[PDB]
């Protein structure tokens, strides 16, 4: 405890001696409390876009969207030796198996630098500290304190997000970006891993897993999965460590050990002072590794609820020694069988087991605290029949056979979830430009993700129309952000890498690329079929005109005649 966060607590304390003050009216239960002192960001409209959707502005699933606790002060129990057995067995084997083609290693300064520069979301700025060297020297300040086991700076910063200062987020990527930056969760090396696939081949992956043998495909969400990591999860992630060597190894253990498994935050709370409070469990880590040790804690939950709908232990309560010996060998015999029934993205996870026992497989995954969100306890799961009706990645996927038979798996969302967000920029000081530059990274994502929604494929066309054709998409896989003609990157995506698109023959026109059926369009909350979308449709040039006289004498390509309706 105090040993090891004492010290970044003790420091703080001093930087505003002048206010420290044990409140003894503090809100907390679950965090332990340390001390207060004196201290003192909404959805902006993107104007581009809404005059180029004006059909939704009556649509209040739309317009409701950019308008505007319980959980985290919650604590889990732990869980029964069986499940505690059962877990160590189970990391203990797949970080060997994510290990066996990959070399855990440092990532560097040079690394670090080039991402900063890029606008990753990882001194005014990142860009100017990381030009400093004042900063290097307090990163190797703090980097031979955690050689010594010892914690300065590493401090959270609550808003749930978790900000710390470069210094500390360096030291984090120092260690633990290879898990990221080398593709340890790729389809390739984890089997039930998408990191790096993107959202152009999820479908895909759905539909190889629904044609293996077995029982309905589950879909079941956790309830606040980052506030039900135990401190033995974060044991079990740890164990990355024994696959290392030199500082590396001793750099990665600091992390887990003095950032991790011990916290320090600092919260904004009204009554205004700032409450530093501390805790060991719960995901508290940068948004990367959090994904990353998300999905390995995942794919360990799921294998475990499969062991279980298969009766490889009976109890929970406490595993016999032959018990262990079996899990082992499953593991060994079954183990990447059962990892390619899994599409695994961080807390979010489609399993197709071998049968449906799976449903009512619940005594370790309740006891881990990985507790399904809308559901009592103890009812068992409802499954999918049909893979194209699974929920993953806040999308469903539609089969779509093309005039020339080739067969497309798409993804798609309810349609006013997409142009709610279209109409949202997040952060101040944006000019017209920027505005627009945003406006057309939308609609050059919809070109290509969702083209087969008739709304979407007519909307981007006019977006991109309105938007001067040199102007570059910005956003402060992505293929849609570049200034390539979006027929060429459809054609590259869609075909030429596409693995399971055996027929290369490129497409010469947007005609020849599907739309889904008219009613299922409807189905997905398509305007196709009101007086409104009609006159929308029927009036564009008018809408392109008007966001072309307020950006003013630019050169602008039209795209509305790549459409049939438009093309005479
Ligand atoms: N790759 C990585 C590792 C650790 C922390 N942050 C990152 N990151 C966040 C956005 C882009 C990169
Ligand atoms: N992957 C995902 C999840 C939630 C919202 N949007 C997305 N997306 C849309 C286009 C590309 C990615
Ligand atoms: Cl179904
Ligand atoms: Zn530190
Ligand atoms: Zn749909």
Same mark, same amino acid.
């Given at each position: 405890?105090?040993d090891?966060?004492?010290?970044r607590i ?37 104007g ?6 004006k059909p939704?502005?009556?649509?209040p699933?739309?317009?409701?969207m ?7 002060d919650?604590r ?15 990391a203990?084997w ?8 990959k ?13 900063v ?34 914690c300065?700076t590493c401090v ?10 470069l ?7 120092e260690?633990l970006? /290879?898990? &990221? ?5 790729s *389809?390739?090396?984890?089997?039930? $891993? #998408?990191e790096?696939?993107?959202? @152009? ?32 999860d974060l ?16 750099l ?5 050990k ?19 409070i ?17 999905? /390995?804690? &995942?794919?360990?939950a799921?294998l475990? *609820?499969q062991?279980?709908?298969? $009766? #490889?232990?009976?109890?929970?309560? @406490? ?5 262990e010996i079996?899990?082992?060998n ?23 087991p ?11 995954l ?19 029949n ?6 993953f990645?806040?999308?469903?996927f ?7 038979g080739?067969?497309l798996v ?10 709610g967000?279209? *109409?949202?920029?997040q952060?101040? $000081?944006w ?12 609609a ?33 896989t992505?293929?849609?952000?570049t200034?390539?003609?979006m ?10 890498e596409?693995?399971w ?9 947007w ?14 909350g398509?305007l ?6 009609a006159?929308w ?11 072309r006289?307020?950006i003013g004498?630019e ?14």
């Amino acid at each position: 405890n105090l040993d090891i966060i004492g010290k970044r607590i003790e420091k703080i304390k001093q930087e505003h001696e002048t206010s420290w003050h044990y409140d003894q009216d503090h809100p907390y239960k679950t965090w332990a409390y340390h001390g207060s002192y004196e201290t003192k960001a909404s959805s902006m409209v993107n104007g581009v876009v809404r005059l180029l959707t004006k059909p939704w502005d009556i649509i209040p699933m739309v317009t409701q969207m950019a308008m505007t606790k319980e959980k985290v002060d919650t604590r889990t129990q732990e869980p029964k030796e069986g499940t505690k057995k059962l877990m160590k067995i189970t990391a203990e084997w797949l970080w060997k198996e994510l290990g066996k083609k990959k070399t855990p290693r440092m990532c560097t300064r040079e690394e670090f630098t080039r991402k900063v520069r890029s606008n990753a979301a990882l001194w005014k700025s990142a860009r100017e500290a990381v030009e400093d060297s004042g900063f290097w020297e307090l990163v190797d300040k703090e980097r031979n304190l955690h050689l010594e086991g010892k914690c300065e700076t590493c401090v959270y910063n609550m808003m749930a997000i978790w900000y710390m200062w470069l210094g500390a987020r360096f030291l984090e990527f120092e260690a633990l970006g /290879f898990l &990221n930056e080398d593709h340890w969760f790729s *389809r390739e090396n984890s089997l039930s $891993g #998408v990191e790096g696939e993107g959202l @152009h081949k999820l479908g895909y992956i759905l539909r190889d897993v629904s044609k293996k043998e077995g029982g309905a495909m589950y879909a079941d969400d956790t309830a606040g999965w980052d506030t039900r990591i135990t401190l033995e999860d974060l044991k079990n992630e740890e164990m990355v460590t024994n696959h290392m060597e030199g500082e590396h190894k001793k750099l990665a253990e600091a992390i887990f050990k003095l950032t991790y498994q011990n916290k320090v935050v600092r919260v904004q709370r009204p009554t205004t002072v700032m409450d530093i409070i501390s805790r060991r469990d719960q995901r508290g880590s940068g948004q990367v590794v959090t994904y990353g040790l998300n999905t /390995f804690t &995942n794919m360990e939950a799921q294998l475990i *609820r499969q062991m279980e709908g298969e $009766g #490889v232990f009976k109890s929970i309560q @406490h595993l016999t020694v032959t018990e262990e010996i079996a899990v082992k060998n499953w593991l060994v015999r079954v183990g990447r069988e059962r990892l390619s029934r899994m599409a695994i993205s961080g807390d979010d996870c489609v399993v197709k087991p071998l049968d449906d026992r799976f449903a009512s497989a619940l005594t370790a995954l309740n006891d881990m605290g990985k507790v399904r969100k809308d559901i009592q306890q103890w009812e068992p799961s409802r499954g999918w029949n049909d893979w194209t009706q699974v929920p993953f990645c806040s999308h469903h996927f539609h089969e779509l056979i093309m005039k020339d038979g080739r067969v497309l798996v798409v993804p798609c969302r309810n349609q006013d979830e997409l142009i709610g967000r279209a *109409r949202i920029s997040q952060g101040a $000081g944006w000019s017209l430009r920027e505005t627009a530059c945003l406006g057309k990274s939308y609609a050059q994502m919809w070109s290509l993700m969702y083209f087969h929604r008739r709304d979407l494929r007519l909307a981007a066309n006019a977006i991109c129309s309105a938007v001067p054709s040199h102007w570059v998409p910005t956003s402060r896989t992505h293929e849609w952000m570049t200034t390539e003609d979006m027929l060429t990157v459809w054609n590259r995506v869609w075909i030429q890498e596409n693995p399971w698109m055996e027929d290369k023959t490129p497409v010469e026109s947007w005609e020849e690329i599907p739309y889904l059926g008219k009613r299922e369009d409807q189905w997905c909350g398509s305007l196709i079929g009101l007086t409104s979308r009609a006159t929308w449709a029927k009036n564009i040039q008018t809408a392109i005109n008007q966001v072309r006289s307020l950006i003013g004498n630019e050169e602008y390509t039209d795209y509305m005649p790549s459409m049939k309706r438009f093309r005479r």
